[PDB]
Write a protein that binds this ligand. Structure first.
Ligand SMILES: Cc1cc2nc3c(=O)[nH]c(=O)nc-3n(C[C@H](O)[C@H](O)[C@H](O)COP(=O)(O)OP(=O)(O)OC[C@H]3O[C@@H](n4cnc5c(N)ncnc54)[C@H](O)[C@@H]3O)c2cc1C
Ligand SMILES: Cc1cc2nc3c(=O)[nH]c(=O)nc-3n(C[C@H](O)[C@H](O)[C@H](O)COP(=O)(O)OP(=O)(O)OC[C@H]3O[C@@H](n4cnc5c(N)ncnc54)[C@H](O)[C@@H]3O)c2cc1C
Lengths: 484, 488
């Protein structure tokens, strides 16, 4: 009854629809499991109507990012502000010393560069970003001070926030990856979603439709059917659900899962072994008003470091001696690095958007509803930030004020992501464990069972534009064929 | 016609290493013919005010992550605790004449757009179709053009000047620099050699002294097809040798491909340098990086960093031109618009105080400034008058008052001396090092004139090209080959 059925209203799915329609193509559908489009792009509303992208929030590689360029043109055309360039000089904070960024004697960023060049060279078998950092420290200790060896490895972990994976879980071979230029903070990714979503017939979209199985009818027909009984049949099928969800079509009923008939060709099934997903998480701390210095919009808190980490480095005879000397509990805000976006400086909002990673993410998302517990967990670093930003310890104003505020940051609310605990996202996005999936998805189960999504592309992989393009790809293809 | 196994022309790090190697391989009867009354070549350490020393040629070990010469030095230090170098990379302080310091600025964010600029340049040439190079200047203009919608007015004004620190990497004004060659990847931090001479002497001392013959200016190399090479010093002597490793500067070697034999440093080749070598000169040129040392009594200024760069003057007018231009064509035209001052180009200052304790400044300059300044390296009064404005400004931004002319004998800076390089006017260097204007040479060089007439030096190798360690490798390269040959 339909031409092509798009599964998923994320930006990939939306783009595909947007394209088809842009090609006159008619009679198509977008089946979304949730009661909203946007997929991993969701803007939520907090205190006083402040808006926040709980999922994606940046246009990466603005130099080449084609989705960003389109937004840029729209803005050049109507003057509407769609994004702001928020890259800033990062501020790094260690519980003990405090600020360790742009340091006269620590010069951490410079060694971090060397560390980077080292990794480029090292490759050009693959270990963990952690192991790699350790190899470097060992291999260059002769040229590193005691303080550099202490904090450098901590500071360099900000990369855990780019992947949303701790350094012992992260692939070093994929850890470093130069970005094609500055980043632009989307002042409404929801505008992008809304703009694309309303660029095709609104009657194509069918929300709360969890597709349970895709059956191939050799007779040049495809049987799609949401688990609510309703069955559809279209010429072509573009599957845009997350890799983590798709990755369920190979296990022995779980929600979101799509039963493929016939099974997914092996090449694809193998890929799920050579590619994993990450768990980047977000916590929004909403303050009554800014009462801290807006020196920068990017702040990173370093996990605790031990002056006895040095002695071990200063001793190991090799990666085996060091490897063992290392294996020689409790999880707090200081157990890992935490990336804080000070929205006050870059968007004029008295809030902090903090990014977290696996394994911490999953745990904090677990207690998303426990505000007193959440505040208690982040209070230390929150206060450590305010001090460094010439302010006072945070007051808890989440419940009906204090009067003793005025000069003290008054927390009014906290918003936590829920991607790990959401059955339709089961994670943040494609991430590397210490590749081929791109091809497996690009080719497609067949001439009519295509794949799209941030995990189905090489350029922009794991990104909004990467997904946006993959949606136009598989689309523009099915656009010409049908056109016939 | 004294018989020799290998005759090395030039006692710079290239030939020194060649000889050295040659020795280690047990080769005997070799000569190192050097024109100056010294060894080292573009590696020279001069003395100044109160015994202070400075390397007026090379000063750094670049790419310390893979620099064989560097590693070799670090090793010797791992075995005796001797300080030979000092990793002096710091956070650059940028000073505009007007707006004072512009580095690490939360609103200007210069270093961030520099980063984007670097990536833009990489993205422009990594996709190498029939690319077509252009000047660095022209590249930055294209960047500003394409990205004007994402730059504030102050960034468009200062960025183009800040990114010009690169001129002091090549020794060339951005209008004369090949964009295609501008951004190279410095593999690792740099180690400020604490006496490059110690590297030179160590290597020199690594072979028979009697092999070294200073003040002998080789005027010609003749290839007797009879399986031999004849070499002639100007001192009249005439040596004969199985192999010759010419390590003279590209600039000096270039003198051979032109009629006029009586040029200081010019070697006469017979047979003349093959066509592939002559023609290779049309494909690369020499840069003019220069050094000026500002020595003061003591240090009455901040030591926040050891890297300070002074940006050239910019104008808000320039910003308006970028905003209104339509393309690269109109931009240049609209750019069509007196006299050189210490603010007509960026200048790079190495604040030796912080990194070495010495109350002195090591300042680098490019072409054409380098030539003009070296031309008047004697007029100390004029030099001070030239660099007074930036000298002050630096001191200002560094918390201090204006400079005091104390050259001809507590909180006020007092300049005692000023040392200037002389590479352009030196007949045996005629420049600084190989540099690109908007590979043929390396190939033609490393493949030699023939089995016997070979070439070494910073201009004869790819890895570390133009670097002290590259020249050094080229030495070990040729020496090894011959060694093998002599072994058989
Ligand atoms: C915390 C976080 C921060 C991020 N930050 C950035 C950033 O700064 N920049 C950037 O570029 N990217 C960022 N991303 C990634 C970006 O969000 C994704 O790359 C992009 O949204 C993926 O798009 P998609 O269209 O493939 O899938 P959408 O999630 O992304 O998912 C596909 C759609 O399929 C639906 N679906 C699943 N199962 C079924 C089913 N059985 N039936 C019907 N529908 C189904 C889903 O509900 C969903 O709507 C971030 C992600 C997270 C989690
Ligand atoms: C101002 C300046 C700063 C620099 N800074 C750095 C730096 O920080 N780091 C770095 O790695 N590199 C630096 N370099 C480059 C480095 O100095 C050179 O790459 C290297 O010294 C070249 O060595 P060479 O042995 O090839 O040649 P030299 O240029 O060393 O040549 C060898 C010798 O040939 C002799 N000679 C010439 N003609 C004749 C003749 N006719 N007969 C006999 N002998 C002759 C010369 O007098 C010379 O001593 C710098 C160069 C300059 C000019």
């Amino acid at each position: 009854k339909k031409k092509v059925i798009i599964i998923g209203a994320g930006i990939a799915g939306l783009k595909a629809a947007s394209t088809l329609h842009q090609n006159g193509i008619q009679d198509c559908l977008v089946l979304e499991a949730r009661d909203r489009v946007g997929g991993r792009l969701q803007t939520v509303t907090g205190y006083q109507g402040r808006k926040y992208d709980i999922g994606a929030s940046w246009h990466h590689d603005t130099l080449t990012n084609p989705l960003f360029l389109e937004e840029a043109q729209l803005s050049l055309n109507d003057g509407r502000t769609r994004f702001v360039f928020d890259d800033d000089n990062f501020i790094y904070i260690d519980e003990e010393r405090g600020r360790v960024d742009h340091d006269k004697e620590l010069l951490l960023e410079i060694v971090d560069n060397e560390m980077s060049k080292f990794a480029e060279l090292e490759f050009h078998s693959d270990c963990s970003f952690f192991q790699l950092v350790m190899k470097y420290l060992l291999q260059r200790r002769q040229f590193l001070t005691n303080d550099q060896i202490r904090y450098l490895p901590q500071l360099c972990r900000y990369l855990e926030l780019w992947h949303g994976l701790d350094w012992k879980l992260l692939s070093a071979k994929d850890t470093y990856f130069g970005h094609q230029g500055r980043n632009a903070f989307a002042l409404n990714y929801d505008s992008v979603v809304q703009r694309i979503a309303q660029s095709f017939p609104q009657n194509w979209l069918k929300l709360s439709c969890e597709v349970k199985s895709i059956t191939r009818e050799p007779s040049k027909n495809v049987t799609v059917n949401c688990e609510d009984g309703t069955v559809y049949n279209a010429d072509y099928v573009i599957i845009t659900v997350p890799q983590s969800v798709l990755n369920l079509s190979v296990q022995p009923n779980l929600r979101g899962r799509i039963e493929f008939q016939p099974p997914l060709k092996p090449v694809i099934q193998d890929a799920f072994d050579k590619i994993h997903f990450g768990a980047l998480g977000k916590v929004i701390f909403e303050f009554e008003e800014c009462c801290w210095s807006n020196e920068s919009s990017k702040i990173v808190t370093l996990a605790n470091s031990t002056n006895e980490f040095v002695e071990i480095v200063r001793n190991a005879e090799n990666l085996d001696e060091l490897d063992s000397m290392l294996e020689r509990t409790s999880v707090t805000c200081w157990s890992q690095p935490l990336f804080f976006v000070n929205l006050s400086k870059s968007t004029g909002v008295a809030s902090f958007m903090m990014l977290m990673q696996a394994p911490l993410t999953n745990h904090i998302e677990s207690i998303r509803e426990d505000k007193e517990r959440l505040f208690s967990f982040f209070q230390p670093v929150l206060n450590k930030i305010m001090k460094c930003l010439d302010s006072e310890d945070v007051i808890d104003g989440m419940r009906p004020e204090n009067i003793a505020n005025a000069n003290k940051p008054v927390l009014r609310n906290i918003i936590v992501s829920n991607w790990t605990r959401d059955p339709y996202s089961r994670g943040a996005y494609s991430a590397c464990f210490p590749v081929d999936m791109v091809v497996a998805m690009s080719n497609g189960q067949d001439s009519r069972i295509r794949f799209a999504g941030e995990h189905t592309i090489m350029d922009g992989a794991g990104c909004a534009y990467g997904a946006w393009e993959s949606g136009r790809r598989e689309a523009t293809r099915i656009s010409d064929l049908l056109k016939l």
